[PDB]
Amino acid sequence: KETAAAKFERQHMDSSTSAASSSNYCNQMMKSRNLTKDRCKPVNTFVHESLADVQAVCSQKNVACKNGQTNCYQSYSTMSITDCRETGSSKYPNCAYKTTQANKHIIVACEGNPYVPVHFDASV
Ligand SMILES: [Cl-]
């Protein structure tokens, strides 16, 4: 079984680019991060910052999670992110995503020792 921290990295980290450079980014990344294997994951955000910078959010601003838990943290800085969401043309096995690039604060849920991101809650 994948660890929670490892799953977060696979689903949400893309430090290799500064930003999505085209409309096909999400189609490509959703496939390669294995988020379309058996069904199309409907919504997924990638963060275009270093792993260290995202990990550091777990010692930034403590805020409530949407679900009412208290282990969420909001980045002090905006970060480059890409939101990927399925479009109406999407039909497994031919998933199709809209790519939306933005610079926004991220909110992550943190757990463990080391205390690291395990869920992507939202951007603001
Ligand atoms: Cl997400």
Does 63 carry a binding-site annotation?
A: no
CATH code for position 123: 3.10.130.10
Active site residues: 12, 119
114 C-alpha to center of ligand 1: Å?
A: 22
**Residue 110 phi, psi (nearest 5):** -120, 145
Q: CB neighbours of 17 closer than 8 A, spacing ≥ 6? A: 48
Please count the structural domains in the chain.
1
DSSP 17-48: -SS--STTHHHHHHHHTTSSSSS--SEEEEE-
- What resolution does the deposited structure have, in angstroms? 1.4
Rounded CA-CA distance 14/7 in Å is 13
45 C-alpha to center of ligand 1: Å?
A: 4
Rg (CA), the chain: 14
106 C-alpha to center of ligand 1: Å?
A: 10
- Strand ranges inside the chain, DSSP E: 43-47, 61-63, 72-74, 79-86, 97-104, 106-111, 116-123
Does 124 carry a binding-site annotation?
A: no
Cα 83 to Cα 1, 14, 27, 44, 115: the distances in Å are 26, 12, 11, 6, 25
Rounded CA-CA distance 42/33 in Å is 14
Does 10 carry a binding-site annotation?
A: yes
Does 61 carry a binding-site annotation?
A: no
Which string of b and e fits 21-43 if b means at least 16 CB within 10 Å?
eeeebbbebbeebebbeeebbee
DSSP 96: -
SS3 call for 7: helix
SS3 call for 78: coil
Range of the domain at 86: 1-124
DSSP 1: -
Q: Which of 55, 90, 89, 58 is nearest to 73 (CA)?
A: 58
Tokens of 102: 């933005």
Tokens of 20: 């999505």
DSSP 77: S
14 C-alpha to center of ligand 1: Å?
A: 13
The structure was resolved experimentally with X-ray
**Residue 121 phi, psi (nearest 5):** -85, -45
